[PDB]
Amino acid sequence: KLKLSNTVLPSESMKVVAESMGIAQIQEETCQLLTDEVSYRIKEIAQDALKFMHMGKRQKLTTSDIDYALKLXXXXXXXXXXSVEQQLYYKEITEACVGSCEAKRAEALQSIATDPGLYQMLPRFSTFISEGVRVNVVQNNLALLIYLMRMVKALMDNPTLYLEKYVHELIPAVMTCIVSRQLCLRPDVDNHWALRDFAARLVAQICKHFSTTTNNIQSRITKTFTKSWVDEKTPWTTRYGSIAGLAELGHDVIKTLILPRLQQEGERIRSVLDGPVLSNIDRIGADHVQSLLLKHCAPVLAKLRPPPDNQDAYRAEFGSLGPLLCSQVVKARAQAALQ
Amino acid sequence: NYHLARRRTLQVVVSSLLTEAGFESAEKASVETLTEMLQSYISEIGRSAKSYCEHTARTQPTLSDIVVTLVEMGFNVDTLPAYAKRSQRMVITXXXXXXXXXXXXXXXXXXXXXXXXXXXXXXXXXXXXXXXXXXXXXXXXXXXYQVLREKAASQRRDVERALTRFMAKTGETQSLFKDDVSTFPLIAARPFTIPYLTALLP
Structure with a gap:
């Protein structure tokens, strides 16, 4: 079943190595016969070193190993997938999601991310969390949003539990948190923008794993966020969630999309700024949204174009970017100087 | 793979001694071979002191033991102060590197149920019941007698009113008010041939 032929070096190259010292013809x-005998000695020392490291109990051979070798008719009632012990452990997970104590919070986040092979406190868990997402969007509570969105973050970092079969009742619940009407109080919208930063950051972790198959991931979400950008007379929570969702998709995604949208959203800047008579909730709302999205899109143009002619770059970015884009280009040059 | 850093630190030592010598270029394989020869020389000093200080019942190698070792290995030790005038005075000491840590974790469930059960050994860690043990599921008990027979009689009433509405709107109809098609469409009279065989039949 096996044939161990003699590995014999070509004798002409051996004569080249010999006559490099200049011996004779x-x-x-x-x-x-020299290659034969040297091969016998090499294979015997190889058997010796294999005996060493199969008594050293490793299948790999290092240099030091051979260096030491050089010493010579009614059916029964049903039963759910859960047991009583793990469904009360399930209730511990759900009530630590409610849990105000941050020590119980981090215990829950570590338990979700580091229970590999759980697989049976899978979808029923994730099903009416997403229904609990739908009720709490109607209930409009920022605390239950940040608890459940970090809960999906711990779900994504658990490497054994694959998402693939169970994708399509979680992603629209994530995208529902992105779009609009997270309004607990009108002076308390400030925490919701960091949520949309966190939610779009989750989508960046989503999109790097599943778009190899049918393009629900890349093609549908981009065309959703494209047409949501087209949607006029919508609140600016829709506009922030769409662009920051496109911002987390990558460098070249923004390079394609915000190449015409550099000046077109700059027209949207100076429609808001120097715009309406008095609506300060929508003014202060849209202003920092346009401020955050400017300096977060700024490293795309900084990597593409050089930071020369800041007065001309403001004319190339419809004025409103200058000099905040030039200040972010100076910050990008300072970040390049840090390297 | 993690053992390689000390050998490359020895290579940094060899490069520092070549900088002390004054070599601008070198052959990299020969430098690594001389590093192998240097660590084999260190191991040879150690083997010499190992087999040398077992001649005593004591273990500890002293200074004079290493003096006899280095004279045994062919070295004039009288230049050891003068080489100090080179080495620790002309070559800057390079530092080591070892960044070890111990991460933190928390998976606090509340289930032990056996500290030192039958195989009694007080050196272990019973993990939990959430991972090891299991249970059984029934998921269906109500057991409410009056409520059960209320449900049964309500379903009987529903069947009564359903068949009532069905053949009320189906067949011959005479009402109570004028045109009670919605509320009470009572079934009109059949009258048929033989009443006694029907009305006296169990």
Whole structure:
């Protein structure tokens, strides 16, 4: 079933190595027998070192190993997938999601991310969390949003539990948190923008794993966020969630999309700024949204174009970007100087 | 793979001694081979002191033991102060590197149920019941007698009113008010041939 032929080096190259020292005119069979005998010694030392490291109990051979070798008719009632012990452990997970104590919070986040092979406190868990998402969007509570969105973050970092079969009742619940009407109080919208930063950051972790198959991931979400950008007379929570969702998709995604949208959203900047009579909730709302999205899109143009002619770059970015884009280009040059 | 850093630190030592010598270029394989020869020389000093200080019942190698070792290995020790005038005075000491840590974790469930059960050994860690043990599920008990027979009689009433509405709107109809098609469409009279065989049949 096996044939162990003699690994014999070519004798002409051996004559090249020999006559590099300049010995003589050499015949073939001498170098053939030399390669034979040297191969026997090499394979015997190889058997010795294999005996060493199969008593050293490793299948790999290092240099030091051979260096030491150089010492010579009614059916029954049903039963759910849960047991009582793990469904009360399930209730511990759900009530630590409610849990105000941050020590119980981090215990829950570590338990979700580091229970590999759980697989049976899978979808029923994730099903009416997403229904609990739908009720709490109607209930409009920022605390239950940040608890459940970090809960999906711990779900994504658990490497054994694959998402693939169970994708399509979680992603629209994530995208529902992105779009609009997270309004607990009108002076308390400030925490919701960091949520949309966190939610779009989750989508960046989503999109790097599943778009190899049918393009629900890349093609549908981009065309959703494209047409949501087209949607006029919508609140600016829709506009922030769409662009920051496109911002987390990558460098070249923004390079394609915000190449015409550099000046077109700059027209949207100076429609808001120097715009309406008095609506300060929508003014202060849209202003920092346009401020955050400017300096977060700024490293795309900084990597593409050089930071020369800041007065001309403001004319290339419809004025409103300058000099905040030039200040972010100076910050990008300072970040390049840090390297 | 993690053992390689000390060998490359020895290579940094060899490069520092070549900088002390004054070599601008070198052959990299020969430098690594001389590093292998240097660590084999260190191991040879150690083997010499190992087999040398077992001649005593004591173990500890002293200074004079290493003096006899280095004279045994062919070295004039009288230049050891003068080489100090080179080495620790002309070559800057390079530092080591070892960044070890111990991460933190928390998976606090509340289930032990056996500290030192039958195989009694007080050196272990019973993990939990959430991972090891299991249970059984029934998920269906109500057991409410009056409520059960209320449900049964309500379903009987529903069947009564359903068949009532069905053949009320189906067949011959005479009402109570004028045109009670919605509320009470009572079934009109059949009258048929033989009443006694029907009305006296169990």
